[PDB]
Amino acid sequence: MAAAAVVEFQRAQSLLSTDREASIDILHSIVKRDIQENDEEAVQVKEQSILELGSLLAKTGQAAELGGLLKYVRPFLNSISKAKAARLVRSLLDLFLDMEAATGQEVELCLECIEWAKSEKRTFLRQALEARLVSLYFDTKRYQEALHLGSQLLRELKKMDDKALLVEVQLLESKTYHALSNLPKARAALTSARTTANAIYCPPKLQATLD
Amino acid sequence: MSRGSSAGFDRHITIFSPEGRLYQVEYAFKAINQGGLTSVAVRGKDCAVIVTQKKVPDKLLDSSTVTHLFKITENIGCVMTGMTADSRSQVQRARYEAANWKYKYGYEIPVDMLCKRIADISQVYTQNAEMRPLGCCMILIGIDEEQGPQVYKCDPAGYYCGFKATAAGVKQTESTSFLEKKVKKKFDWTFEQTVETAITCLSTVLSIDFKPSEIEVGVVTVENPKFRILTEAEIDAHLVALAERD
């Protein structure tokens, strides 16, 4: 923002060539300039600022550091107050899931994003975060934990039956509920999924997974 | 039926209709094809070029006199496509609008502004039932005073928007399709290349290939702001160039 053309481009190169450690310092700086969203001269810089943060991970693969840098990203996501927020978080979350720096670290970061997303804002932002969080919970084999979080999605969101993110959260739930070996639940979750799935605003991929 | 059904008095004069536009307005689009002209517009980065068919229906014409290229100002040049009756009349209306800016402003009108004042003018005709909309469209070229060479076109119903490439004619949809592939494959634009894209596209769809006295090419270059007629010798030069492309 005051320099996501100068400082951010250099940081990206340093992340590919060498290690994230050098980059930890730069990462703090760029996010702090980005905090001011701007609405009258935001321009080309803001669109890049938010994009690079999302693209940052898996340029050196799994590290302790990969998990760590991310925490700075958490204050930025919240502060900006734009639509473009949804995109960044979802991205940044999916990449850490792929490159595990520790299950413990990954669960903390998604839990915090979600808590903030539940407070005010929108149903759309909360849903992307939760798919990341139930999937982390399914694989770790904490089936019980997934059930809790999952239930929040069913109760509130039903009203909307046109929601594309929401099919993905709920099919990961049905599967977890199968593993848990509570059969009523397995059907229940499917019911929520299919209602929202019927909508014509959901890609062929999403329609396919339902089945 | 449709395109000839009463629902108010909207197949007679301008008022909306069951079709979700206006019937009278649609005849004014249909009207472009009748004239028999087809144009290709390319925007360069050293000039802005329009090539349109020049309607020659006698052998007792002097070349200079018979044209559709008109000088609106010493910054803007145009071609008229559609019905020729409507063409002369719109051009005289534009000229008063160009002149009106010309005294007040103290400088040459922007291509965008010229198109905005005329576009609105074509809308009055369209809004009114007192007169029918224009059977023609004016497609402008000119050096914009900082944006660069610019190509704008105003509709026969009068709405204008900017273009990399435009086409209007007998076959409006097909010329435009031929034209996007020429832009995609990017030979780049010099004086000669951009003129060359423009003529070929007009030749390929209709499937003619012209004499230089049955196409007209008009440019506004950054050699000077004044609009010029290239005349047959230079128009012939461009025709020969089209061979063994791209």
């Binding site: 009258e40 639509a83 473009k84 804002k121 929108r122 | 909306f16 007169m131 900017g162 273009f163 990399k164």
Partner: protein, 234 residues
């Protein structure tokens, strides 16, 4: 002009209680490309999708979002020709108000003034009633304003409304997601969702335009920013 002219109205009532031409006009606004306007209550955002479908439009100028003056902007729905006069008209009005107040035209006031001219156009002959719906945004006097102006002349002040293709679906989503006095982030996000509700106008950045009004005036957004907001919606 050089003729006798017309003066007879093209609209006659009905024993229904309707005016016939405005109902045909209402069909034309629906046939447009999605245009949404929401007053957040932390700024006003007008977003539209523009059917170019070839991206052979070198517009760095005119668009479906065009600024009227420096803290008013306009977005339309339907057909382009009717827009062209209304956009010029609005700029003229902006100029009239600029001379006396020297703070450019306020939104509540603008609508009344456009509404009166629109009504004549129905009421009189040699002119016809529009079939465009305008969404007017402004931030002036430390309050955001969003109004919708119908092709008859009518004006209603909305918190969030939709027009263009599949407006019925749009207005219903808008009630569920958007509730009154939610944040600038929510207003923008649902705004881009309505466009995504049904697109089909070539998916490239230069095929959507947003212009935002806030405390510092009005500017239209670069097409690249607009795409980032879209990217979130699947």
């Amino acid at each position: 002009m050089a003729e006798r002219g017309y003066s007879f109205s093209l609209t006659t009532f009905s024993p229904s209680g309707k005016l016939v031409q405005i109902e045909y006009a209402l069909a034309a606004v629906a046939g447009g490309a999605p245009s949404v306007g929401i007053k957040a209550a932390n700024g006003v955002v007008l977003a539209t999708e523009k059917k170019q479908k070839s991206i052979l439009y070198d517009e760095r100028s005119v668009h479906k979002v065009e600024p009227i003056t420096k803290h008013i902007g306009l977005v339309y729905s339907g057909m382009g020709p009717d827009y062209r006069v209304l956009v010029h008209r609005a700029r003229k009005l902006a100029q009239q108000y600029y001379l006396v107040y020297q703070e450019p035209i306020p939104t509540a006031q603008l609508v009344q003034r456009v509404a009166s001219v629109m009504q004549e156009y129905t009421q009189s002959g040699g002119v016809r009633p529009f079939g465009v719906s305008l969404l007017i945004c402004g931030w002036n006097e430390g309050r955001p304003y969003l109004f919708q102006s119908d092709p008859s002349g009518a004006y209603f002040a909305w918190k969030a409304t939709a027009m263009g293709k599949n407006y019925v679906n749009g207005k219903t989503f808008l009630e569920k997601r958007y509730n009154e006095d939610l944040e600038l982030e929510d207003a923008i996000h649902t705004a881009i969702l309505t466009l995504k509700e049904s697109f089909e106008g070539q998916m490239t950045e230069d095929n959507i335009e947003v212009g935002i009004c806030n405390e510092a005036g009005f500017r239209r957004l670069t097409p690249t920013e607009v795409r980032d907001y879209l990217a979130a919606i699947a």
